[PDB]
Design a protein around this motif. Structure first.
Motif, mmCIF file in Angstrom:
data_model
loop_
_atom_site.group_PDB
_atom_site.id
_atom_site.type_symbol
_atom_site.label_atom_id
_atom_site.label_comp_id
_atom_site.label_asym_id
_atom_site.label_seq_id
_atom_site.Cartn_x
_atom_site.Cartn_y
_atom_site.Cartn_z
ATOM 1 N N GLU A 467 33.195 41.615 34.711
ATOM 2 C CA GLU A 467 33.034 42.118 33.346
ATOM 3 C C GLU A 467 33.824 43.399 33.110
ATOM 4 O O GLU A 467 34.223 43.678 31.973
ATOM 5 N N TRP A 468 34.055 44.181 34.161
ATOM 6 C CA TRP A 468 34.680 45.485 34.008
ATOM 7 C C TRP A 468 36.086 45.375 33.425
ATOM 8 O O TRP A 468 36.879 44.503 33.798
ATOM 9 N N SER A 469 36.402 46.305 32.528
ATOM 10 C CA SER A 469 37.758 46.477 32.034
ATOM 11 C C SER A 469 38.713 46.653 33.204
ATOM 12 O O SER A 469 38.276 46.889 34.338
ATOM 13 N N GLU A 470 40.019 46.518 32.946
ATOM 14 C CA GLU A 470 40.996 46.719 34.014
ATOM 15 C C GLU A 470 40.991 48.161 34.489
ATOM 16 O O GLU A 470 41.320 48.442 35.652
ATOM 17 N N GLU A 471 40.605 49.092 33.624
ATOM 18 C CA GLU A 471 40.673 50.465 34.088
ATOM 19 C C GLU A 471 39.477 50.814 34.956
ATOM 20 O O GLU A 471 39.626 51.510 35.968
ATOM 21 N N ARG A 473 37.876 48.637 36.849
ATOM 22 C CA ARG A 473 38.267 48.018 38.115
ATOM 23 C C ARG A 473 39.199 48.919 38.920
ATOM 24 O O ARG A 473 38.991 49.135 40.122
ATOM 25 N N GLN A 474 40.277 49.395 38.285
ATOM 26 C CA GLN A 474 41.209 50.283 38.983
ATOM 27 C C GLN A 474 40.498 51.502 39.556
ATOM 28 O O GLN A 474 40.746 51.901 40.700
ATOM 29 N N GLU A 475 39.621 52.120 38.769
ATOM 30 C CA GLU A 475 38.959 53.337 39.225
ATOM 31 C C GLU A 475 38.033 53.077 40.406
ATOM 32 O O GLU A 475 38.099 53.791 41.422
ATOM 33 N N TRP A 476 37.161 52.065 40.294
ATOM 34 C CA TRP A 476 36.275 51.759 41.410
ATOM 35 C C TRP A 476 37.080 51.463 42.667
ATOM 36 O O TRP A 476 36.829 52.051 43.731
ATOM 37 N N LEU A 477 38.102 50.602 42.545
ATOM 38 C CA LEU A 477 38.908 50.254 43.713
ATOM 39 C C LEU A 477 39.529 51.492 44.337
ATOM 40 O O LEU A 477 39.537 51.646 45.566
ATOM 41 N N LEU A 478 39.999 52.415 43.508
ATOM 42 C CA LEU A 478 40.611 53.619 44.054
ATOM 43 C C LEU A 478 39.585 54.453 44.810
ATOM 44 O O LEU A 478 39.845 54.900 45.935
ATOM 45 N N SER A 479 38.404 54.664 44.212
ATOM 46 C CA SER A 479 37.395 55.485 44.871
ATOM 47 C C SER A 479 37.022 54.917 46.230
ATOM 48 O O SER A 479 36.944 55.661 47.215
ATOM 49 N N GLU A 480 36.836 53.595 46.317
ATOM 50 C CA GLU A 480 36.458 53.005 47.599
ATOM 51 C C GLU A 480 37.583 53.122 48.622
ATOM 52 O O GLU A 480 37.327 53.433 49.793
ATOM 53 N N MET A 523 49.249 34.166 40.447
ATOM 54 C CA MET A 523 48.702 34.504 39.139
ATOM 55 C C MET A 523 48.380 35.990 39.049
ATOM 56 O O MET A 523 47.365 36.384 38.477
ATOM 57 N N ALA A 524 49.211 36.814 39.670
ATOM 58 C CA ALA A 524 49.033 38.250 39.561
ATOM 59 C C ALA A 524 49.372 38.695 38.144
ATOM 60 O O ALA A 524 50.248 38.112 37.497
ATOM 61 N N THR A 525 48.623 39.690 37.637
ATOM 62 C CA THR A 525 48.787 40.208 36.269
ATOM 63 C C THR A 525 48.611 41.711 36.123
ATOM 64 O O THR A 525 49.006 42.255 35.085
ATOM 65 N N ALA A 526 48.000 42.401 37.076
ATOM 66 C CA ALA A 526 47.592 43.783 36.878
ATOM 67 C C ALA A 526 47.499 44.460 38.233
ATOM 68 O O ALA A 526 47.384 43.783 39.261
ATOM 69 N N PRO A 527 47.572 45.792 38.274
ATOM 70 C CA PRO A 527 47.585 46.475 39.582
ATOM 71 C C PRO A 527 46.305 46.267 40.380
ATOM 72 O O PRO A 527 46.344 46.250 41.622
ATOM 73 N N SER A 528 45.170 46.066 39.694
ATOM 74 C CA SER A 528 43.901 45.839 40.379
ATOM 75 C C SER A 528 43.927 44.579 41.235
ATOM 76 O O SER A 528 43.140 44.466 42.182
ATOM 77 N N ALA A 563 55.504 47.726 33.951
ATOM 78 C CA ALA A 563 54.455 48.716 33.738
ATOM 79 C C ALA A 563 53.434 48.669 34.868
ATOM 80 O O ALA A 563 53.026 49.715 35.389
ATOM 81 N N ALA A 564 53.027 47.464 35.270
ATOM 82 C CA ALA A 564 52.039 47.324 36.336
ATOM 83 C C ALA A 564 52.533 47.921 37.651
ATOM 84 O O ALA A 564 51.785 48.625 38.338
ATOM 85 N N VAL A 565 53.779 47.635 38.034
ATOM 86 C CA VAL A 565 54.294 48.125 39.314
ATOM 87 C C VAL A 565 54.528 49.632 39.267
ATOM 88 O O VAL A 565 54.371 50.333 40.281
ATOM 89 N N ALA A 566 54.934 50.154 38.101
ATOM 90 C CA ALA A 566 55.068 51.601 37.950
ATOM 91 C C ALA A 566 53.712 52.270 38.104
ATOM 92 O O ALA A 566 53.570 53.256 38.834
ATOM 93 N N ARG A 567 52.698 51.733 37.423
ATOM 94 C CA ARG A 567 51.337 52.236 37.580
ATOM 95 C C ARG A 567 50.872 52.172 39.038
ATOM 96 O O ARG A 567 50.142 53.057 39.499
#
Ligand code: CL
Ligand code: CL
Lengths: 935, 944
Positions: A467-471, A473-480, A523-528, A563-567
Motif C-alpha cells: 500500500e505504501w507510496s513509492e517514497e 517504500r524508499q524511506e523504510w528500505l533506506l532506514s533498514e 518489470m523494474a520501474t522504480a528505485p525501491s 530519473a530512477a537511476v539518478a535517484r
C-alpha cells in the motif's frame, strides 16, 4: 536412378547466379539432398521417396514464382496422408532444412574474403564478406583516428566482452545432435578439399551418408520437456565443441595483431577480454520449473564440467613442462610439495622427481583439480562431502597462483617462449572460464519482492509495503539498510512463492561468489525495486552480494528510468555498495511487445543517452545489457555494425550481450565461425570506444519523434484497440497450441485470463513467426513512413540520408528488411483460408495489405529495389531455406485444421511403408529452426 | 651480422646436390630448423658459443662432402680445447640438431608423392616406399596369378601380422621428448600448407621455435636408469600416438580396396589381421632387473592403459549411438539392464532412458570398463582389491558380446551404415588390442632351466640332470610328463636364480591367458630344452601353458634344429599338446655374432626350408619369429621386399616380426608412416602366401655353400683366433664404457663368446666401422671370383633375380653408407697402442676391399645407386654424426687417461656442468661421453 538430375535443376533455378567464385553452395545442397533422399528411399521405400521429392520440387517452384496453385498442389498431396505418412514427410523436411543449414555454415566458413570489395566506410561492417578483422580495425584506429598504439593496448587490457547464453525459446537440441551435425559438416568440408585422394574421397562419402542416416534415425521428442539441468547440459556442449580451445586461439591472434602495430607486450593472461554468463538455471521470470535446487544443480554441474576440462588439459601441460632450470622461488615450492604422500598419473611416470620442478607443482595442481571435481559431484548427488575444501581450489586465485609461479620462473631463466606455449593458453583458459565456465544470472519479477516485503512488514506490524507510496517504500528500505538489526527470522508466514524467493537467496548464499553474475529485476520501474533486492540479499546472509540489474520493459518504464537511476545514485548506501559500476538491462523484444518496434528502438537509443548523462554526473561506469531482440543479437556480420551503432559512451569497455538460442549454433559450432564471432565482438567494442557513431542531426530526432508517435498509434490501435483482434490471433496462428504443448518450459501468459498485455514477449514473436507473417516486427513502420511522406515528399530524402549516414537507423531498417525476406503473405493467407472464420477474413486481408505497404516503404527508405540488395549472400542463403520451410508451413496449417476440427474428414491414401500432435510439433520445431531469429 | 644463414644454406645445398623428385623440400626443412635452433643457442649460451658450434658443423659438412682428413683434424683441434662445460653444450647441441634432421626426414617421407610412372614392373619396385605396391596394387595377384577375389578375401581373413615391441638397446627416449618432436613435425608440416594466412604462418613459426627450445631445455640424463616399468611406459607411447587410431583407419582402407576388386563383404571385425606382442617386462635373458614382480607390474599396467582408452573412446560411441529402433534381443537386454541403481556421465545425461537401448547397454559397458581399470590399479598398488571380479571384464568375449549385440541389432533394422561407423571402429580395436593392448612374451636361457632340473634331481637322489645325455634327459622328462605325481614342494633347496625361475612361473600362473604370448628359450639346442620348459609350466600349476618357442642361436644349433623339431613332433604328448601350431625363433644378429653375417644369412634360409619340410611331413602350421637384425627388421620400404624374399611357404598367413627399438619412431611416430607400415606388412604377407619367390638354381646353392665356408673361416679367424683381437676391441671401441655406464644391463654372460650380441653390434657401430655386419663378405667374393672368372656374372644374376640375395646385399650396402674408415682411424690414433696400429690398418683394408666387392656384385659404382632418396637422407645425418664421433674419441682419450692435459679455452656462457654431481670421473666428461653415445646411436639407427 536419374532422379538426382532434377534437384540440381530446381536448386539452380532457385538462386540463379553465383555470389562469388568459391560459391559452391548449390553444389553442397544438391549433394546433401541426393544422399539424404537415397537414404529415405532405402529406409521407407520408393513411394515415400517419390512423394517427398515431388513435394520439394513443388515448393521450389512456389518459391520461384509465388504462384498459389503450387500451394494448392502441396495441400492436395499433404491432406491425403494418414498421420503415419505425415510424420515421415514432416520429419524428412525438418532434416532437409537442417542439412541446408550445415551447407550454409561450410560456405560461410570457407568463403574467401574479397579485399577489393570494401567501400571504406561503416557499411562494410554489416557483412562478414567485408567487415574489418582485428588488424584492419587496428589500422583504422591508428590511421583515420590518430590513436597511439599504447592507447589501443591500454584500452584492450581494460575491455570485457561478456556473452550471455540463454535457454532456447524452444528446442535446445540434444547434446548428441551437435555431434552429428559436426560430423556431417566436417565430411562436407573435406570432400571439397583440393588435395583429396580417390579412396579418401570414397570413405568420406560413405561417412557422410552414414551420418545423415544416423541423424534421421534418432527421435527428436519424448521423455520430459527436459529438466533445466538437461537443457543446461545441452547448452554447455559448445565448450567441448569450439569455445574451450577457441578462446586461447583468439587471444593469441590479438597478440599478433598487436605486434604488427609495434606493441611488444601480450594482452595480460589474467585480463578478462572474454566472459561467459548463462541464464540456464537462473531465469525464473514466469518459469516455476526453475527451483532453488535447479540453481544449485546447474551451479555444481558447471563446476564439475570445468574441473574435468582443466584436468584433462593439465596432462599435456605436464608433458610439456619438463625443464630443469627454474626460479629460486619455484625450486623452494618444488622441494616443499615433494613433502607429501601421485595416483592419477601412474600410467605416465611412477612418480615425479624434484629434477622436474614444474612437473611437480603441476602434478599437485592436477591432484587438487581432481579433488575439486569429486567434491562437486558429491554435493550434487548427496548434499554433504568428505573431500576437505582445503584439498580443493575454492576461489580463482588459489588456482592461478602456482601457474603464475611457473610463468614467472620460466621467464626468469630466459624461457619465456615456452611460457607462451601451452602454459599461456592454460592461464588464459583459467582467467576466461574461471572455476564454473559460466556465471549464472538470476532473474525474477519485481512483484515477487513486493510480496516478500509485504509479508515481512505485515509480520512486523508496520503496515503493508504494497500500500505504501513509492517514497514511503524508499524511506523504510533506506532506514533498514542503514541499520544494524536483522529483519526477520524463521517465524514468518511464507506462501510457496515467498518461500521460493527467500530459498533462492539462501542457495545463492551457500555457493561461491565466482558462480554468480547478476540479479535481474524483471518489470523494474522504480528505485525501491533495486533496493528491495539489495536488502533481501543482505538479510539472507549473502556474504558477497550480486550486482543488481534493473530491466526496464514497458515504454513508460523506459522514460522514467534515467530519473530512477539518478535517484538511486543520490543515495549514499547504493553509491557505496556498487563501487563505481552499474549495469542496466533493456529488452528490445519486450519493449517491442509494449509499443511496437520502431518506437521501442528510438526510445531505447534516447534512454541510453539520458542514462549516460546520469552515469557521468555521478561518476559510475555504466554497462548496458542487451536483452533478446536487438540488432546486436543477430548472427554474424550485422552484429559488427549494430555494436558500432550504439550511442556514444554507452559501451565504455564493457559489452554484455545475449547470444539467442536460435543463433548460437550458427555462431559457435565451427572453429572459423567461433573465431570470427569473438573477433568482431572484440574489435567492434574496441573501435566504438575511440570512434563513436555520428551524433544525429536535430531534424532527424524531431522526425523520429513524430514517426514514433504515429507508429505507436497504429500498433496500439490494431493490437489492443480492435475488439476482434485476439479471436483472429488465436485462429490465424498456433499460439494456443504452443502454450499447451511440450515445446518450452514456460507458460505463455502471466495471467491465463488476460489479453495481449499479460502474454510474454517470446510467445508473441513465435506465434506470428510460424506463419511467415511477423506482424510484431514490422507493424507500425508503415504508417510512420507514410505519415511523414504525406506531410512532405522531402522527408523521404531525409529518411534516405539517415539510412545512408546514421548507423543506428541503418541497422534498424536493415533488421526489418531481413525479417521481410523471411516473410510471405501468401502462406499467411493460406492459414487464414483454413483456420479463420469467414467474417474475420477481411481483417487478415487488411493486415496483409499493411504488410505489403510497409515492405514497399522499407525498400524505398533503404534505396533498394529488391529486399537485401546489399547482402546478396544472405539473400541467397535465405531463399534456399524458403523451399523447405514453405512445405513445413502448408503441413502445419492443414494439421491445425485437422487437430482443431474433428469434423474435417479427409480421403486418406494407403499408408506408405515402414498421431497428429507429433506431426504438429515437428512442423513447429522445423519452421522454428528455419526462420532462426527475427525480433 | 646475421648472414650465417647464407653459410648453412650453402653447406647444406652442397651436401645434397640435386632433387630426388620435385616435392623434394628436404634441404629447405633442414635449413629452416637449423637456423631457428642456432638462434636459440645464441640467445641462451652466447654469440661465441653459437659461432663455435656453427663452425664445427660447417667443417663436418665439408668432410662428409670430400672426406678430406684435414677437416677431421680441424674438428678435433677445436673440440680438445673446450673445458667440460663447453664440451657438454657442444655435444648436447649436436644431438638436438641430429634429431631435428630426423624430424625433417619424417615429414619429407610422409608427404612425398608416389610416382606411378617410376615403377619398373617387377619385384624390385617393392624395395622403396616411392614405388612399392599399395594394398590395391597387390590387383597384381589377380592379373599375373589369376586368383579370384574370393580367394584373396579368404586369404586376408585368416592372415595375422604380429608386431613385437622390444625394449630399446639404449635410449627409448622419454615419453616427453617424443611429444616435443611431434609438435615440431606438425609445425613444419603446416608451415608448408599451400593455403596458410600470414598471421597463421607467423604463429606457426613462433610455435616451432618455442618447441625447439622447449626440447633443448629438457635434460637427457639424470634420475634412475629407468626401471623396466618406466621403459615399458615409454614403449607404450606409440599406442596413444598413432596405433590406436591407426588400426581402424588401416582396416577400413582394406575394406575399400576389397570393394575396388568386386567383393561386397568387409573384413570381419573379429579377425586378427593386426596384433601387437611385447617383450618389455618379460625378457630376463641376462637381465636380473627383470624380476617376477616386474612381469606382474607390466601385465597389470597394460590392462590399465587398455581400459582407460576403451573408457574414453566409449563416450564418443555413446553419443553417436542415439538410435531407437533395435533388435528384439537388444530391447530385452536393455530392459534387463534397466534394473539397477549412472555416475560416470552426470555431465552428459542425469541418467540414460530406455528409449535409447544402445546407449543403455553401452553405458553398462562403460561402467564395467571403469571397474576394470580400478581393480587393476588396486591389484598393482596393493596386491588385493575389493572390486568384485564379476563387475569387470576378465576375458575378451565378455567384452565382445554386448557390442556384437549392438552390431547385430543395428544391421537387423537396416542400420548397417550406422553400424559401420564408430561402432565398427570400436569392435575392431577390441579385437586387435584386447584387454591388454599387447601380449607379453617371456624369455629365459636354457641353461637356467637346466639348473632348476638339476637341483630337483639332486634333491630326489636320482643323479644330476646336467650329467645326463640328451636322450637320457629326454627319457626322464618323458616319463614325468606321462606321470600323475607332482614333482617338488616347498622343501627344495633353491638358489636365488632357481627361485627367480620358479617364481616367474608362479606369476605366469596367477595371471589371465590374454596377457601372454610365447615362452622363448634362449640358447635352445635340443628337444630336452623345450621339454624342460613344458614340464616346469605344468608342475608350477600354469593352467593354460604358454606356447614354447625355441631360439636356435649358434650355427651348429641351426644345423641341428630341424632334427630337434622333428624329434619333438614325433613325441606323442608334445604332438597332442601344441594343437598343430609351432613357432620357432631365429636371431639374425645372434647367429651373425657366431659365424659372420653371410653364413648366418644363408644358413637361416636353408634351416627355414628344412623346417617347412618337417612341418608338412607331420602336418603342423609352422610360424617363424624373426628376431632383431634381420632383413625384415629395417625401416620402411625395404621391409616389403624382405618379407617377399622369405623361402616359399615359410610365412603361411602368420607373420611374427620384431620391431627394433631404433626403428620404432621412424615407423610409428606419424599418421602416414604408421599406415604404410601396417600396409606393407599386410600386403607383403598376403602376396607371399600366394606368390612365392623363385626357387634358387642349384648352382646358386652350391656357390652360396662355398662362400659361406670361406666367410665363416675369415670371420672366425679374425674374431676368435687372433689373440690380440680382444685387446684391440677394448681400445678402438667404447665397449667397456658401454657396459660400465648406465645403458642396458649386463654385456657378458670371459671373451666375445660370452659377450651379448647387442653390445657387440653397438661397440662397432659407434665408431662408424660396422665390422660385425660385413666381415667375411670380402674373402668370400674374392674366393669365388678367383676360383672362376664367371662367378661374378652369376652373383650379379643372383642380385638381379633372387630376392633373398638382393636384400642381403642391399642391407650390407646400406650399412656401408653409414660407414667411414677415416673416423675409425681417428679412434685408432687417439685410443690404440702403436704396436697395434697395423691391425686396425689391415682391418680397414678389408672394409674397403669388401666395399668395392659389394659394389660390383650389386652392379653399382656408388653406394645405394638404386635408392637416391635414402642416400640423400643418410648423407644429411652424417654431417652431425661425424662431429659427435670426434667429440666421442677425444672424450674417451681424456677419460681413460688423466695424464692427457690439454690447453683449455675460457668457458663460454651460462649451468649444465652440475647435473651429474656423484661422478667418479671428471665434472663434465661422463655426461659428454653419454651424450655422444645416445647421439651417434640416434644417428646411425639400424645396422645388423
Ligand atoms: Cl611401477
Ligand atoms: Cl541432475
Amino acid at each position: 536412378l536419374e532422379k538426382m538430375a532434377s534437384i540440381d535443376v530446381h536448386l539452380r533455378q532457385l538462386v540463379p547466379g553465383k555470389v562469388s567464385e568459391d560459391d559452391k553452395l548449390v553444389e553442397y545442397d544438391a549433394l546433401l539432398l541426393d544422399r539424404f533422399l537415397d537414404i529415405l528411399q532405402d529406409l521407407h521405400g520408393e513411394d515415400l521417396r517419390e512423394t517427398v521429392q515431388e513435394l520439394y520440387e513443388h515448393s521450389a517452384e512456389y518459391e520461384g514464382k509465388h504462384e498459389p496453385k503450387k500451394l494448392e498442389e502441396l495441400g492436395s498431396v499433404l491432406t491425403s496422408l494418414d498421420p503415419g505418412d505425415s510424420i515421415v514427410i514432416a520429419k524428412a523436411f525438418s532434416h532437409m532444412l537442417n542439412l541446408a543449414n550445415l551447407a550454409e555454415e561450410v560456405q560461410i566458413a570457407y568463403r574467401r574474403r574479397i579485399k577489393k570489395l570494401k567501400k571504406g566506410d561503416f557499411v562494410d561492417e554489416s557483412s562478414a564478406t567485408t567487415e574489418s578483422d582485428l588488424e584492419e580495425t587496428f589500422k583504422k584506429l591508428v590511421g583515420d583516428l590518430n590513436k597511439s598504439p599504447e592507447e589501443i593496448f591500454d584500452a584492450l587490457k581494460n575491455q570485457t566482452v561478456d556473452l550471455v547464453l540463454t535457454a532456447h525459446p524452444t528446442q535446445s537440441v540434444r547434446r548428441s545432435l551437435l555431434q552429428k551435425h559436426g560430423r556431417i559438416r566436417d565430411c562436407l568440408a573435406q570432400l571439397y578439399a583440393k588435395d583429396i585422394t580417390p579412396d579418401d574421397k570414397q570413405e568420406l562419402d560413405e561417412a557422410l551418408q552414414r551420418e545423415i542416416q544416423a541423424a534421421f534415425r534418432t527421435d527428436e521428442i519424448k521423455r520430459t520437456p527436459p529438466t533445466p539441468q538437461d537443457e543446461m547440459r545441452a547448452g554447455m556442449s559448445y565448450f567441448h565443441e569450439t569455445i574451450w580451445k577457441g578462446v586461447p586461439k583468439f587471444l593469441r591472434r590479438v597478440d599478433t595483431a598487436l605486434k604488427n602495430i609495434g606493441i611488444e607486450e601480450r594482452v595480460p593472461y589474467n585480463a578478462p577480454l572474454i566472459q561467459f554468463s548463462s541464464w540456464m538455471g537462473g531465469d525464473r521470470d514466469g518459469n516455476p520449473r526453475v527451483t532453488p535446487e535447479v540453481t544449485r544443480d546447474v551451479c555444481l554441474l558447471a563446476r564439475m564440467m570445468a574441473a574435468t576440462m582443466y584436468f584433462n588439459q593439465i596432462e599435456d601441460l605436464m608433458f610439456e613442462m619438463s625443464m630443469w632450470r627454474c626460479n629460486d622461488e619455484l625450486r623452494a615450492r618444488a622441494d616443499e610439495v615433494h613433502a607429501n604422500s601421485a595416483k592419477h598419473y601412474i600410467e605416465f611416470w611412477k612418480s615425479i622427481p624434484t629434477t622436474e620442478p614444474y612437473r611437480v607443482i603441476l602434478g599437485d595442481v592436477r591432484d587438487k583439480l581432481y579433488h575439486t571435481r569429486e567434491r562437486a559431484h558429491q554435493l550434487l548427488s548427496n548434499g554433504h562431502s568428505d573431500v576437505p575444501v582445503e584439498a580443493t581450489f575454492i576461489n580463482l586465485e588459489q588456482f592461478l597462483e602456482p601457474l603464475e609461479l611457473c610463468y614467472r620462473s620460466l621467464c626468469s631463466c630466459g624461457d619465456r617462449p615456452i611460457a607462451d606455449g601451452s602454459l599461456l593458453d592454460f592461464l588464459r583458459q583459467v582467467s576466461t572460464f574461471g572455476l564454473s565456465l559460466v556465471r549464472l544470472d538470476i532473474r525474477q519479477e519485481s512483484d515477487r519482492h513486493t510480496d516478500v516485503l509485504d509479508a515481512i512488514t505485515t509480520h512486523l506490524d508496520i503496515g503493508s509495503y504494497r500500500e505504501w507510496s513509492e517514497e514511503r517504500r524508499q524511506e523504510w528500505l533506506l532506514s533498514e539498510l542503514s541499520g544494524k538489526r536483522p529483519l526477520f527470522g524463521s517465524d514468518l508466514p511464507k506462501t510457496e512463492e515467498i518461500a521460493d524467493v527467500l530459498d533462492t537467496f539462501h542457495v545463492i548464499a551457500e555457493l561461491p561468489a565466482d558462480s554468480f553474475g547478476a540479479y535481474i529485476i524483471s518489470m523494474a520501474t522504480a528505485p525501491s525495486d533495486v533496493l528491495a533486492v539489495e536488502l533481501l540479499q543482505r538479510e539472507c546472509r549473502v556474504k558477497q552480494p550480486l550486482r543488481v540489474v534493473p530491466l526496464f520493459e514497458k515504454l513508460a518504464d523506459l522514460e522514467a528510468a534515467p530519473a530512477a537511476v539518478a535517484r538511486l545514485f543520490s543515495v549514499d548506501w547504493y553509491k557505496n555498495r556498487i563501487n563505481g559500476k552499474q549495469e542496466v538491462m533493456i529488452g528490445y523484444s519486450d519493449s517491442g511487445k509494449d509499443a511496437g518496434r520502431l518506437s521501442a528502438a528510438w526510445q531505447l537509443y534516447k534512454a541510453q543517452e539520458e542514462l549516460v548523462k546520469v552515469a557521468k554526473e555521478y561518476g559510475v561506469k555504466l554497462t548496458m545489457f542487451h536483452g533478446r531482440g536487438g540488432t546486436v543479437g543477430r548472427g554474424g556480420g550485422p552484429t559488427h555494425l549494430a555494436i558500432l551503432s550504439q550511442p556514444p559512451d554507452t559501451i565504455n569497455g564493457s559489452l554484455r550481450v545475449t547470444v539467442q538460442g536460435e543463433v548460437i549454433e550458427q555462431s559457435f559450432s565451427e572453429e572459423h565461425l567461433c573465431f570470427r564471432t569473438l573477433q568482431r565482438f572484440t574489435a567492434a567494442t574496441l573501435e566504438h570506444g575511440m570512434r563513436p557513431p555520428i551524433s544525429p542531426k536535430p531534424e532527424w530526432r524531431a522526425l523520429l519523434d513524430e514517426m514514433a508517435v504515429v507508429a505507436t498509434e497504429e500498433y496500439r490501435s490494431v493490437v489492443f484497440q480492435e475488439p476482434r483482434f485476439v479471436e483472429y490471433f488465436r485462429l490465424a496462428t498456433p499460439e494456443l497450441e504452443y502454450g499447451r504443448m511440450n515445446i518450452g518450459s514456460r507458460p505463455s501468459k502471466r495471467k491465463p485470463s488476460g489479453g495481449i498485455e499479460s502474454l510474454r514477449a517470446i510467445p508473441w514473436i513465435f506465434a506470428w513467426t510460424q506463419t511467415r507473417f511477423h506482424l510484431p516486427v514490422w507493424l507500425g513502420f508503415g504508417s510512420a513512413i507514410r505519415h511523414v511522406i504525406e506531410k512532405d515528399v522531402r522527408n523521404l530524402h531525409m529518411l534516405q540520408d539517415m539510412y545512408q549516414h546514421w548507423p543506428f537507423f541503418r541497422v534498424t531498417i536493415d533488421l526489418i528488411e531481413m525479417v521481410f525476406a523471411k516473410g510471405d503473405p501468401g502462406i499467411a493467407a493460406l492459414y487464414d483460408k483454413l483456420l479463420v472464420s469467414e467474417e474475420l477474413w477481411p481483417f487478415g486481408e487488411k493486415l496483409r495489405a499493411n504488410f505489403e505497404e510497409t515492405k514497399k516503404l522499407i525498400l524505398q527508405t533503404a534505396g533498394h529495389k529488391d529486399l537485401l540488395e546489399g547482402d546478396p549472400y544472405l539473400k541467397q542463403r535465405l531463399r534456399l531455406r524458403d523451399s523447405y520451410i514453405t512445405t513445413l508451413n502448408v503441413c502445419q496449417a492443414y494439421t491445425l485444421k485437422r487437430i482443431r476440427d474433428p469434423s474435417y474428414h479427409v480421403t486418406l491414401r494407403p499408408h506408405i511403408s515402414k498421431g497428429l500432435e507429433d506431426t504438429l510439433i515437428l512442423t513447429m520445431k522445423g519452421i522454428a529452426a528455419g526462420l532462426q531469429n527475427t525480433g
